[PDB]
A and B are shown apart, each in its own frame.
With several copies, the nearest count.
Chain A
Amino acid sequence: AQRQFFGLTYNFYGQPAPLFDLNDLQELAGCYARPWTSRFSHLAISTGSLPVWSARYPSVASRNIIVNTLLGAHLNPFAGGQVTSHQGITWRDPVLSSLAPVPAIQPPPVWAVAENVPLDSNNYPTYVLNLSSMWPINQDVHIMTMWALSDQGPIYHLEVPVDPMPAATTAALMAYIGVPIAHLAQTAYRFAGQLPQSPDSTMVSTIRWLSAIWFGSLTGRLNRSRTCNGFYFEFAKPALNPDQAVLKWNDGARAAPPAAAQSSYMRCISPHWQHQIVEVAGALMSQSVTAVTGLPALIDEATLPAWSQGVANLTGNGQGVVPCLDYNPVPMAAARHLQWRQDGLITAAQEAQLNNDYTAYALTIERHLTAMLVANPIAAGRMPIQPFNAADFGQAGQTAAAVALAQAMFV
């Protein structure tokens, strides 16, 4: 298994306190139930079936964001080695099974509020001694950290080995052919979440490949024409709803393995991710792998918010540092369409049409989110959506480098 993890709590955007409502806690983690695998209980196949369009939690990412903020107020044992209380609520037991209001006879000490708190497993010995039962905490803490480290989209990791896929993964993928991405993400989250696993397990390699294939198809390098061992993803029409993708297997020519092992960190540079299911699912799926295997290497600090500069065990600027790339969906879509034309899947006339449709589609997302922010100002004390500025929708980021990586990743 993996007997240790490191983490980092969220950042307050100038606000004095963690940004969540008691009702949010009572809603999203109440009932004295275990909160440690609930991230998918409120997700579905598509936005059309979900109440993400109005009222509280009016965004795809809203619930998970609030969850991360909520945990930041109660992860003190991995920072100070002691369970604490915040606004009259604390854990029921040293195992951190569930939350409850504080007892009246011997209350635990009140938590002193802070932000961006580094976290170590070793600070709380009882965790390792009860690793078999406290395992799910590992995944969620990792996920929270992977999101807290970045403004805009969360961070996740990619890698491709020089070897071909093992047969086990091949068989496994051949059973997930027609599945949409959202369902796939659930299984990955479900897998790594509920019991310890070794990194040398078939599922771990399987999910690792999935993240690679997803990105390769996202950049448009992997298509019906060119595939990884026969597999590739298919994206829905921008004319109706491009925020959907499913797995496919095909006769197409198989891409050759890279000359050397490739790996990098990724994130979305634009606010569109907050209301776009494929981004959320892709990130969560990829983050699941790192949860069970740990971080392969320190993340480059060069392009991260101020609070992420030089976080112990997480970020660095030395030699053993993996760069992190980022992209904007709209330029990414244009690149994907261009690759399709060069592969001959489409004509030039269609490529122009596709760009127009996707841009129109993205505009609605921007229009919806920007109106949603003023409806939920962060000064209200809870953050349903991450703050941003209008110009953030126009950043091209490192998109050119990103497609270049896929170019080198699937030769």
Chain B
Amino acid sequence: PFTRLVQNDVITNVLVARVDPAQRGDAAVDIRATHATFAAALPVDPAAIV
């Protein structure tokens, strides 16, 4: 979802997990500690956009 100026709703991470954390006993852990993270960014140029 596209959030807009809502500080508490800013999406910091998109996550994916290959294994069931319940088996590892990670049921109560921070989600970031249990799921992989995507990290990709593209540096566009304002001048072309304008």
- The reply to whether A and B meet directly (CB within 8 Å) is yes
Mark interface residues in B22-50 (1 if CB within 8 Å of A CB, else 0).
10000110000000000000000000000
Smallest Cβ-Cβ distance to A100: which chain B residue? B22
Mark interface residues in A102-124 (1 if CB within 8 Å of B CB, else 0).
01010000000000000000000
Query: What total count of A-B pairs have CB within 8 Å?
Result: 4
Number of interface residues of A (CB under 8 A): 2
Smallest Cβ-Cβ distance to A101: which chain B residue? B22
Residues of A within 8 Å of B22, CB to CB, are 103
Give the distance to chain B from A389, nearest Cβ to Cβ, in Å. Answer: 48
Residues of B within 8 Å of A103, CB to CB, are 22, 27
Mark interface residues in A16-59 (1 if CB within 8 Å of B CB, else 0).
00000000000000000000000000000000000000000000
Give the distance to chain B from A98, nearest Cβ to Cβ, in Å. Answer: 12
Residues of A within 8 Å of B27, CB to CB, are 103, 105
Query: Which residues from 64 to 109 on chain A have a C-beta closer than 8 Å to any C-beta of chain B?
Result: 103, 105
Smallest Cβ-Cβ distance to A92: which chain B residue? B22
Give the distance to chain A from B18, nearest Cβ to Cβ, in Å. Answer: 15
Smallest Cβ-Cβ distance to B22: which chain A residue? A103
Residues of B within 8 Å of A105, CB to CB, are 27-28
Residues of A within 8 Å of B28, CB to CB, are 105
Closest 4 CB pairs of A and B: A105-B27, A103-B27, A103-B22, A105-B28
Q: List 4 A-B contacts (CB under 8 A).
A: A103-B22, A103-B27, A105-B27, A105-B28
Residues of A within 8 A of B (CB): 103, 105
